[PDB]
């Protein structure tokens, strides 16, 4: 995560660097589900950047 942070990705709240999410991410069908997932995994502050 030293190399990723030096790219400028704002990931000081991601619980794990690999962020291997569940397999029902692929079953999603709305951008409201996709943003809410990124909010809960705390990767949203990269999208705000």
């Amino acid at each position: 995560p030293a190399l990723v942070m030096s790219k400028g990705h704002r990931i000081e709240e991601v619980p794990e660097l690999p962020l291997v999410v569940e397999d029902k991410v692929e079953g999603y069908k709305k951008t409201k589900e996709a943003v809410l997932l990124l909010k809960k995994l705390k990767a949203w502050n990269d999208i705000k950047k």
Binding site: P1, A2, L3, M5, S6, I11, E12, V14, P15, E16
Partner: protein
């Protein structure tokens, strides 16, 4: 490892800021704020960082914990010291020496902490 992911970010990092024959790095745990293998706040297992507090008064001493380092939400322990100037610095010297946690960053951390306290101190 430290020397490996130094040779990647020594010239080609987001934080690197070259101008006027001067090279700094705007890293969240760099203290002395310069492009080095020592003071880089992202490379190492052990890292010390001194910030001004969330409010006006006090400082915040940031210690990177040994255990989980691919685990960035739990990697850093933040403590606040809102004491007098001597008792603020004495706490930092006792956090860095008496844990044997980067003894080469002891004097640089006390100089930075003193500068933060002198900054948040009114002008006549």
């Amino acid at each position: 490892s430290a020397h490996l992911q130094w040779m990647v970010v020594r010239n080609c990092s987001s934080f690197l800021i070259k101008r006027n024959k001067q090279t700094y790095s705007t890293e969240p745990n760099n203290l002395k704020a310069r492009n080095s293998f020592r003071y880089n706040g992202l490379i190492h297992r052990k890292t010390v960082g001194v910030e001004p507090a969330a409010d006006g008064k006090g400082v915040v001493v940031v210690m990177k914990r040994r255990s989980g380092q691919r685990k960035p939400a739990t990697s850093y322990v933040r403590t606040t010291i809102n004491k007098n100037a001597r008792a603020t610095l004495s706490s930092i010297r006792h956090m860095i020496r008496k844990n044997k946690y980067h003894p080469d960053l002891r004097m640089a951390a006390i100089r930075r902490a003193s500068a933060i306290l002198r900054s948040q101190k009114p002008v006549m």
